[PDB]
Amino acid sequence: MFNLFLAVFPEIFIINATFILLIHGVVFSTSKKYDYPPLASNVGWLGLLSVLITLLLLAAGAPLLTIAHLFWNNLFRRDNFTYFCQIFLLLSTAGTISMCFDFFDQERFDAFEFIVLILLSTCGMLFMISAYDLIAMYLAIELQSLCFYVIAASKRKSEFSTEAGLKYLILGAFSSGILLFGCSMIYGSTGATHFDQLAKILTGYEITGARSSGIFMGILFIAVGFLFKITAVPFHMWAPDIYE
């Protein structure tokens, strides 16, 4: 029973640490004893430690994380590709969160919700790599999307941050709608939301022999949504403004 969760510890731990950090920050940011301390660097260091610990958990579970693969089949399918992709994304997140510590105290930006949202978006990304179905794919996309929509407009004094956040919001919502409309018809014309059975109903017959106007256009819309997600030309409507 409990041992069937040995494949989800690198994520359960990060969620629990995220919750603990949120609780600690909200409790001790309003304490009159310490006179509302600026515990953004503290939460950031604890989050970096949590990321390192879940990286250690992920690295040492290489023989693991492939057990109970039948039970988790409908939800996600993690393998050697997923293992390395997650172990590199988590390192990138650790480096990014580490190189931004001085930003918290140099310009006096003590909002610990920034760090918890970084952590929770990282958890969403860890879901995305393991995601092996259209539903989980879309939900894991939406986790990071909403986290970034919140984070982009965090600095609420500069007209650039707010407008860039709003543009990112609108563009990401449109891209998500496009991608979801694309997935809807691929589900409609074949059923089989799961990737394993989606790769088996389409391999049977080539598109050249007979034309299916549903699967092709659903695949096209999924690709268009993904190109919006990575901001690939010509789907680069506002990306420089978002980054500036």
Binding to other proteins in span 11-70, by CB under 8 A: 69-70
Q: How far is the CB of 73 from other proteins (least distance, A)?
A: 5
Of the candidates 201, 74, 203, 49, the residue with the CA atom closest to the CA atom of residue 132: 74
Q: How far is the CB of 200 from other proteins (least distance, A)?
A: 5
Using the rule CB under 8 A, which residue among 203, 206, 211, 233 binds other proteins?
203
Cα–Cα distance for residue pair 98/115, rounded to 1 Å: 11
241 touches other proteins by CB under 8 A: no
CB closer to other proteins out of 204 and 234: 204
DSSP E strands: which ranges in the chain? none
Using the rule CB under 8 A, which residue among 16, 26, 27, 200 binds other proteins?
200
Cα–Cα distance for residue pair 244/239, rounded to 1 Å: 9
Identify whether 234 is preceded by a cis peptide bond (ω within 30 of 0): yes
Using the rule CB under 8 A, which residue among 92, 197, 205, 207 binds other proteins?
197
Tokens 């989800």 — which residue?
Answer: 8
Using the rule CB under 8 A, which residue among 30, 31, 73, 158 binds other proteins?
73
Could you tell me which residues come within 8 angstroms of residue 23 by beta carbon, excluding any fewer than 6 positions away?
none
- Contact footprint for other proteins (CB under 8 A): 69-70, 73, 77, 79, 194, 196-197, 199-200, 203
